Amino acid sequence: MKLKGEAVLITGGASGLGRALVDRFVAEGAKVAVLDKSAERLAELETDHGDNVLGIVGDVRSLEDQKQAASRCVARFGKIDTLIPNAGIWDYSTALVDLPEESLDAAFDEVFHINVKGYIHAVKACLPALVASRGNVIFTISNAGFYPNGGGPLYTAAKHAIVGLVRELAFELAPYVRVNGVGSGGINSDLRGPSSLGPLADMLKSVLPIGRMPEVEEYTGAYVFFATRGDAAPATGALLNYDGGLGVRGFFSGAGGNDLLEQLNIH
Amino acid sequence: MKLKGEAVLITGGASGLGRALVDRFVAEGAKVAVLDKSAERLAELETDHGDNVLGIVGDVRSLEDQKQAASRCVARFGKIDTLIPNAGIWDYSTALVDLPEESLDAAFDEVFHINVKGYIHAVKACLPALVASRGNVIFTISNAGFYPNGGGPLYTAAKHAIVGLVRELAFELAPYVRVNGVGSGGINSDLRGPSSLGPLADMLKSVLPIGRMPEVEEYTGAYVFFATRGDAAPATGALLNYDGGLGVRGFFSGAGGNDLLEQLNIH
Amino acid sequence: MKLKGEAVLITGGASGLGRALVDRFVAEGAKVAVLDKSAERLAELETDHGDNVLGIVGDVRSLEDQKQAASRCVARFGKIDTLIPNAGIWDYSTALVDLPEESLDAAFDEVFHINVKGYIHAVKACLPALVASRGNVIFTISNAGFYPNGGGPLYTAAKHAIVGLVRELAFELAPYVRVNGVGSGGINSDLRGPSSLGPLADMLKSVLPIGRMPEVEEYTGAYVFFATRGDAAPATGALLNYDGGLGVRGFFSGAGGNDLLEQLNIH
Amino acid sequence: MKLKGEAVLITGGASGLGRALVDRFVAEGAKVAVLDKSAERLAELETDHGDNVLGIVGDVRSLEDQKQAASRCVARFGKIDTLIPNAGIWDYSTALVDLPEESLDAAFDEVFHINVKGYIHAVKACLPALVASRGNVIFTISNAGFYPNGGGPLYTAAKHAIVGLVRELAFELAPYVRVNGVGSGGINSDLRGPSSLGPLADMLKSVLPIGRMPEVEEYTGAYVFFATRGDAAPATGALLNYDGGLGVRGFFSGAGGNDLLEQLNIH
Ligand SMILES: NC(=O)c1ccc[n+]([C@@H]2O[C@H](COP(=O)([O-])OP(=O)(O)OC[C@H]3O[C@@H](n4cnc5c(N)ncnc54)[C@H](O)[C@@H]3O)[C@@H](O)[C@H]2O)c1
Ligand SMILES: NC(=O)c1ccc[n+]([C@@H]2O[C@H](COP(=O)([O-])OP(=O)(O)OC[C@H]3O[C@@H](n4cnc5c(N)ncnc54)[C@H](O)[C@@H]3O)[C@@H](O)[C@H]2O)c1
Ligand SMILES: NC(=O)c1ccc[n+]([C@@H]2O[C@H](COP(=O)([O-])OP(=O)(O)OC[C@H]3O[C@@H](n4cnc5c(N)ncnc54)[C@H](O)[C@@H]3O)[C@@H](O)[C@H]2O)c1
Ligand SMILES: NC(=O)c1ccc[n+]([C@@H]2O[C@H](COP(=O)([O-])OP(=O)(O)OC[C@H]3O[C@@H](n4cnc5c(N)ncnc54)[C@H](O)[C@@H]3O)[C@@H](O)[C@H]2O)c1
């Protein structure tokens, strides 16, 4: 239990990676406040964890919902140690040529309001509390914040924008708050596309050096690491690629050592 | 005259770096179409260059103004070889803690609609023409797309977003259109801040390795290079840091060799 | 005890960061084999940890000493799960202009043989064992592998070379062995300079965003993370900057939020 | 003729990319001194260019040969404006598992002495002249200095080491000398492998976004750009990826827009 007594606020924690994070942080001894728009999924979370979790129904695009989540977390758990802005929506890799002219403006706002402005509002709302606890922020980025072909122009630009948030907020909030970003890979979640615009495992296993798409729980360890003051004190402004090795894949094969057992005579 | 007969479309070309680019590209033999919201400054440009330039008054946030600029450029000059999305607004380095809650939503849209959506709309509007000419796109980024302290969270995230546009559009438009980004530094322009939120040379000379802030005309050579098919054919998805060396400055001094003349006995 | 029953081989583990790593990994339940040239310091380590550690006196530049360390680790502890090539020497930030012509060749070999070839030999020697255990390699890099002014040309080029080892070996050894690199910062160790060429805390606290130079034990958490199969399975080819935020420091100040308590009225 | 009256020194200029560079720089009006070990190829160069070129037979691993090249260039052409360290040898992508134990030490020195130490010696020898002319250094790197699978561990680590030279020497030689690096791609040259260890176009066209391997002359434009004081004054410490887009290639296809003509109805 590395995070006993710590309080953590997670946006988009009712499903997918966010939900795995709530489960992992509770197992590490933390209390977790979650801001999510789905009342039903938040109810499930409260059923499973009881008073180890606090559900706040609200939209990340709303600074007022964000401030309500922060004040309720402070009221219930006394502080906010770690903030994990994670809620997001994908653009279903719609290429530029396939983005319809009539909804490009609306899709731009949907994607950027959720994925980028929602991240800024979480930090703005929790700032006073994070400074008081000398806490930290861990942004969920994705391989889309580093390499192409993880989404179309909208999602790729929005996730690259979060790299800029990591660097600029690591500078601005130092020396009180540490700010780091996790470049997580593909997950079998319920990630939705933009309303404005109306397999993963098998496709990707040939391009990932690790040779398999990780389960959603295998992506929680990096967040625990960055949230641990005793292990991550020198980490601020860090960007951890954590997607199975997409950035080091080969030209013609994902992995270059599929034949290592045979080459070294291991059995 | 490296670009004789080439046609170039520049957004935000009526002032500052954009205007220097128009002057340089005309001097290289190109015809230049400019999309800018300032009627008055566009008039000045037309006075100076005559029919080597074409002024289109319009907003980069409007896909219809962008499409009007592209069709007028094609009508007048027959094609579009190079597109340079460059219009932008700064956030006056307003830190997160100083961004007022009541105008954060509006400032987010002003900054992102101009600096990011305006860049996407320029490419969307000029796509058919760029594919026909096997042309290229050169985005104006800034040191703010790479390092902190070049603006607050809004401008730093928006310029980092353009790095994502470079990578994703270089992939998507290959092999027909090359897409590259220029990380230009500080200029003595008329760069304005957000309406929503209501020296440079002397401050920065101690932190720049080159020891002086470059004149606006010294930043035009990199664009000419990327627009030259005979010199930049292997360049796609490239990001050129071009800001005086901010990224390689030292810990305690901008430059590490201020004493080299004395150390080597040069006079 | 996150690494109970794991076996770890550390080069240069008798002093400084290496020694802190041995202490931390033993505390996490691992058995640790150490390859170091100092017989005396290895004796101290064996005194402190008894049969939780194994000392092998040898030079990292010698492939035969490296192979002896690997076979002794396998003989004693049955396997090798994690390999941490860490031994190194600094160049005392001797700039290019100050490197004497008469010893430049010798200094080049001393620095590169230890810091780079020593890392390749450790992986070559432990390869068969790492493939059998599906283990991982964690290279100690430094801020010198990312930014200037952490050493002169020799040390900066040698540490940047290790970034190339991370990427190329992450590709080549996948999908069996994960390869990651830690960009650790300044430590109060006994790091020596090159024989060929014959404060830290107080100097650096004004340039580090965290505002203090971390103790040597605060740099061990990132290695434990990467060595934990249950937390770092998606991490291969990763480079973690872990130096107090040097890469996100400001232009005129290390940290941009020294006044946050006063600005937010915290007491 | 962008470089009339400029003097340029190129190492490894008698063949492949180096030779194309000599041809291009002479065509731009420069005088070029070349340091190469091949007497025969240097003779050919002198036959083709006459007294626009100066051939110095010598080894880049020898600081004395390097100093002889620099003093002869200064004697003949009066100065040294641009220095282009370019000589190199490949490792034939020999993976770590295939590197023989008995020649690993010798191969390490052959590769690093030529590719890395040869680059340091060129700058050391030409330093006084570069400071006097406020000149610049352009290192030939390669895609191997950025991504895996461009060579084995030795060549990939050596080319990544040159990125460290770019950053550290850009800092140390500022504000007098600009230092930049070109990440050139695959060429149909006579690049040899290590003596110690005893198609390209067709293989790579499916992974390059541009869809073809560039001719050797198409890689010379970036060097001319960086050597032009009037166009590259703000460029120092820059790293230009220039390899056909390897870094932005897709997961399943090199280019993502092979069908753009059909999708946009162009003919
Ligand atoms: N699934 C993938 O392949 C993947 C890959 C990489 C990175 N990511 C990123 O991981 C993060 C989590 O995505 P996920 O896969 O877990 O998706 P998910 O859809 O399962 O989870 C998103 C959660 O955010 C909540 N949410 C969505 N919009 C909201 C809004 N406006 N206000 C409040 N809550 C809102 C949803 O209700 C949901 O509970 C996102 O940032 C996503 O971009 C996902
Ligand atoms: N000035 C600097 O220090 C600096 C530094 C780095 C990068 N940049 C970038 O360089 C680019 C040019 O900025 P600049 O310094 O030349 O500024 P500038 O203000 O002089 O030029 C901006 C031009 O864009 C036009 N413009 C602004 N908003 C518009 C809109 N909505 N629609 C159409 N046209 C619009 C303006 O009328 C003006 O002519 C921008 O992307 C900016 O972010 C500037
Ligand atoms: N001290 C710093 O500021 C610092 C900063 C960043 C990164 N680093 C890196 O951390 C790693 C550890 O350095 P440190 O500070 O702990 O230094 P240190 O001198 O205290 O430890 C180096 C250890 O390596 C052993 N060693 C040296 N040469 C050897 C050889 N040829 N063969 C076998 N063993 C040998 C030494 O005997 C010693 O026990 C190195 O890679 C160094 O580059 C150090
Ligand atoms: N060919 C490729 O695919 C390729 C790809 C990317 C980068 N590069 C790089 O481009 C640069 C030029 O390589 P190239 O393709 O033109 O190869 P090349 O073999 O045709 O040219 C190398 C030149 O260097 C000279 N040389 C070699 N060792 C020398 C030494 N010890 N002293 C003096 N001169 C020496 C050779 O005689 C030759 O004239 C190298 O740095 C190489 O790493 C090559």
The answer, yes or no, to whether any atom of ligand 4 lies below 6 A from the CB of D196, is no
Q: E strand or H helix at D138, and its extent?
A: strand D136-140
DSSP B132: H
- In DSSP terms, B8 is beta-bridged to B32, B82
* Closest of C116, D251, D44, B164 to residue A116, by C-alpha: B164
Measure the CA–CA gap between A210 and C232, rounded to whole angstroms: 11
Q: What Å distances lie between residue C176 and A183, A209, A243, A247, CA to CA?
A: 22, 9, 16, 17
- In DSSP terms, D83 is beta-bridged to D9, D137
Residue with tokens 């700064």, as numbered in its chain: B90
Residue C255 among known ligand-binding residues: no
Q: Which amino acid is at A110?
A: E
Q: E strand or H helix at D179, and its extent?
A: strand D178-184
The answer, yes or no, to whether any atom of ligand 2 lies below 6 A from the CB of B244, is no
The answer, yes or no, to whether any atom of ligand 4 lies below 6 A from the CB of D156, is no
Answer whether D156's CB lies under 8 Å from D181's CB.
no
CA distance B245 to chain D (A): 5
Residue D20 among known ligand-binding residues: yes
Exposure string over D22-59, b if 16+ CB within 10 A, otherwise e: bbbbbebebbbbbbbbeeebbeebbeebeebbbbbbbb
- In DSSP terms, B140 is beta-bridged to B182
Q: Please give the number of the atom of ligand 1 that sits closest to the Cα of A13.
A: 39
Given CB atoms, is C263 within the 8 Å cutoff of chain B?
A: yes
Neighbouring C-beta atoms of residue B243, cutoff 10 Å: 31
Measure the CA–CA gap between C12 and C58, rounded to whole angstroms: 10
* Residue range of the domain that includes B79: 1-267
Q: E strand or H helix at D254, and its extent?
A: none
Residue with tokens 């069996």, as numbered in its chain: C176
**Shortest CA distance from C266: residue in chain A:** A132
**Shortest CA distance from B173: residue in chain D:** D257
Q: Which amino acid is at C222?
A: A
Torsion of CA C33, C126, C154, D177, to 10 degrees: -130
* Cβ-Cβ contacts under 8 Å for D75 (sequence gap 6 or more): none
Distance from the CA of D191 to the center of ligand 4, in angstroms? 5
Q: E strand or H helix at C53, and its extent?
A: strand C53-57
CA distance D75 to chain B (A): 17
The answer, yes or no, to whether any atom of ligand 4 lies below 6 A from the CB of D114, is yes
**Shortest CA distance from C148: residue in chain D:** D168
Neighbouring C-beta atoms of residue C211, cutoff 10 Å: 17
Measure the CA–CA gap between C263 and C182, rounded to whole angstroms: 35
Measure the CA–CA gap between A237 and A171, rounded to whole angstroms: 8
Neighbouring C-beta atoms of residue C102, cutoff 10 Å: 8
How many CA within 13 A on the CB side of residue C111?
33
Measure the CA–CA gap between B174 and B180, rounded to whole angstroms: 12
Q: What strands, in cross-sheet order, belong to the sheet with C82-84?
A: C53-57, C31-36, C7-11, C82-84, C136-140, C178-184, C239-242
Answer whether B12's CB lies under 8 Å from B88's CB.
yes
Cis peptide bond N-terminal to C175, omega within 30: yes
Residue with tokens 């993963």, as numbered in its chain: A200
The answer, yes or no, to whether any atom of ligand 2 lies below 6 A from the CB of B220, is no
Q: 3-state class of B138 per DSSP?
A: strand
Given CB atoms, is C181 within the 8 Å cutoff of chain D?
A: no
Q: Which of A119, A155, A219, A223 is catalytic?
A: A155
Residue B195 among known ligand-binding residues: no
DSSP C87: -
Measure the CA–CA gap between B193 and B143, rounded to whole angstroms: 17
Answer whether B114's CB lies under 8 Å from B61's CB.
yes
* Closest of D66, D39, D82 to residue D182, by C-alpha: D82
Q: Which residue, among A24, A137, A260, A263, would best test binding to C if mutated, counting the most C CBs under 10 Å from its CB?
A: A260
Q: Please give the number of the atom of ligand 2 that sits closest to the Cα of B191.
A: 19
Neighbouring C-beta atoms of residue C4, cutoff 10 Å: 9
- DSSP for D180-205, written as a single string: EEEEE----S-----GGG--HHHHHT
At C82, list the tokens. Answer: 């994690």
Helix locations, chain B, DSSP H: 16-27, 39-49, 63-77, 104-112, 118-133, 153-173, 200-204, 221-227, 229-232, 260-264
Using an 8 Å CB-CB cutoff, list chain C residues near B251. 149, 204, 207, 246
**Could you tell me the maximum CA-CA distance found in chain B, to the nearest angstrom?**
62
Q: Please give the number of the atom of ligand 4 that sits closest to the Cα of D87.
A: 24
Cis peptide bond N-terminal to A85, omega within 30: no
Q: Please give the number of the atom of ligand 2 that sits closest to the Cα of B200.
A: 3
Q: Which of B236, B249, B250 sits opposite D248 (nearest CB)?
A: B236
Answer whether D7's CB lies under 8 Å from D78's CB.
yes
The catalytic residues of D are 155
Q: What strands, in cross-sheet order, belong to the sheet with D7-11?
A: D53-57, D31-36, D7-11, D82-84, D136-140, D178-184, D239-242
Measure the CA–CA gap between C13 and C11, rounded to whole angstroms: 5
- Size (chain D), residues: 267
Rg (CA), chain A: 19
Q: How many CB pairs under 8 A join A and D?
A: 34
Q: What angle do CA A111, A117, A119 make, to 5 degrees?
A: 105
Measure the CA–CA gap between D189 and D20, rounded to whole angstroms: 10
Rg (CA), chain B: 19
**Shortest CA distance from A256: residue in chain C:** C172
Neighbouring C-beta atoms of residue C41, cutoff 10 Å: 19
Q: E strand or H helix at D20, and its extent?
A: helix D16-27
Residue with tokens 């000589």, as numbered in its chain: D87
Handedness of CA B67, B73, B76, B77 (dihedral sign): negative
Contact B148 A172 (CB under 8 A): yes
Ligand 3 is surrounded, with C-beta below 6 A, by C 12, 14-18, 36-38, 41, 59-61, 86-89, 114, 140, 142, 184-187, 189-192
Using an 8 Å CB-CB cutoff, list chain C residues near B147. 248
Q: E strand or H helix at C118, and its extent?
A: helix C118-133
Q: In the annotation, is B155 catalytic?
A: yes
Contact B162 A157 (CB under 8 A): yes
**Shortest CA distance from D175: residue in chain B:** B210
Answer whether B30's CB lies under 8 Å from B2's CB.
no
At A173, list the tokens. Answer: 């909030």
At A139, list the tokens. Answer: 């942004």
Identify which ligand lies nearest to the alpha carbon of D42: 4
Distance from the CA of B87 to the center of ligand 2, in angstroms? 4
Residue A12 among known ligand-binding residues: yes
What is the count of structural domains for chain B? 1
On the 0-12 / 13-18 / 19+ scale of CB atoms within 10 A, C254 is buried
Answer whether C260's CB lies under 8 Å from A176's CB.
yes
Q: Which of residues 158-177 of C touch D (CB under 8 A)?
A: 158-165, 167-173
Q: Which amino acid is at B262?
A: E
Q: Which of C204, C246, C251 sits opposite B149 (nearest CB)?
A: C251
Q: What angle do CA D145, D148, D150 make, to 5 degrees?
A: 70
At B170, list the tokens. Answer: 């270089």
Measure the CA–CA gap between C23 and D195, rounded to whole angstroms: 44
Cis peptide bond N-terminal to C194, omega within 30: no
- Residue minimizing CA distance to atom 11 of ligand 2: B86
Q: What strands, in cross-sheet order, belong to the sheet with B82-84?
A: B53-57, B31-36, B7-11, B82-84, B136-140, B178-184, B239-242
Identify which ligand lies nearest to the alpha carbon of A241: 1
CA distance A239 to chain C (A): 7
* Cβ-Cβ contacts under 8 Å for C53 (sequence gap 6 or more): C22, C26, C31, C32, C33, C34, C45, C46
Ligand 1 is surrounded, with C-beta below 6 A, by A 12, 14-18, 36-38, 41, 59-61, 86-89, 114, 140, 142, 184-187, 189-192
CATH number of the domain where residue A87 is located: 3.40.50.720
Identify which ligand lies nearest to the alpha carbon of A142: 1
Q: 3-state class of B35 per DSSP?
A: strand
At D88, list the tokens. Answer: 């190199």
Measure the CA–CA gap between A170 and C254, rounded to whole angstroms: 11
Given CB atoms, is C43 within the 8 Å cutoff of chain D?
A: no
Residue D142 among known ligand-binding residues: yes
CA distance D171 to chain A (A): 22
Q: Decide the pairing of beta strands C7-11 and B82-84.
A: unpaired
Contact D148 C170 (CB under 8 A): yes
Q: According to the entry, how was the structure determined?
A: X-ray
The answer, yes or no, to whether any atom of ligand 2 lies below 6 A from the CB of B36, is yes
**Backbone conformation region of residue B180, classed left if phi is above 0, alpha if psi is from -120 to 50, else beta:** beta
Q: 3-state class of B192 per DSSP?
A: coil
SS (H, E, C) chain A: CCCCCCEEEEECCCCHHHHHHHHHHHHCCCEEEEEECCHHHHHHHHHHHHHHEEEEECCCCCHHHHHHHHHHHHHHHCCCCEEECCCCCCCCCCCHHHCCHHHHHHHHHHHHHHHHHHHHHHHHHHHHHHHHHCCEEEEECCHHHCCCCCCCHHHHHHHHHHHHHHHHHHHHHCCCCEEEEEEECCCCCCCCCCHHHCCHHHHHCCCCCCCCCCCHHHHCHHHHHHHCHHHHCCCCCCEEEECCCHHHCCCCCCCCCCCHHHHHCCC
At B209, list the tokens. Answer: 């390795």
Measure the CA–CA gap between B57 and B37, rounded to whole angstroms: 5
Answer whether A154's CB lies under 8 Å from A106's CB.
no
Answer whether C91's CB lies under 8 Å from C155's CB.
yes
Q: Please give the number of the atom of ligand 3 that sits closest to the Cα of C186.
A: 3
Measure the CA–CA gap between D187 and D216, rounded to whole angstroms: 6
- In DSSP terms, B54 is beta-bridged to B33
Residue with tokens 């946006």, as numbered in its chain: A11
> Which of D34, D189, D242 gets mutated to test ligand 4 (max ligand atoms within 8 A of its CB)?
D189
At C200, list the tokens. Answer: 């830290």
Q: What are phi and psi of C76, to 5 degrees?
A: -75, -45
At C103, list the tokens. Answer: 């010893």
Contact C238 A233 (CB under 8 A): no
Measure the CA–CA gap between B229 and B221, rounded to whole angstroms: 14
Residue C23 among known ligand-binding residues: yes
Residue numbers after which chain A is interrupted (C to N above 2.5 A) read: 198
* Closest of A79, A82, A85, A60 to residue A177, by C-alpha: A82
Q: 3-state class of C67 per DSSP?
A: helix
Q: 3-state class of D111 per DSSP?
A: helix
Q: What are phi and psi of A6, to 5 degrees?
A: -85, 150
Q: Which of residues 110-169 of A touch C (CB under 8 A)?
A: 127-128, 131-132, 166-168
Q: Which of B149, B251, B263 sits opposite C207 (nearest CB)?
A: B251
Residue C142 among known ligand-binding residues: yes
CA A179 to chain centre: 13
Handedness of CA A173, A175, A176, A182 (dihedral sign): positive
At B98, list the tokens. Answer: 């100083």
At D259, list the tokens. Answer: 């069908």
- In DSSP terms, C221 is beta-bridged to none
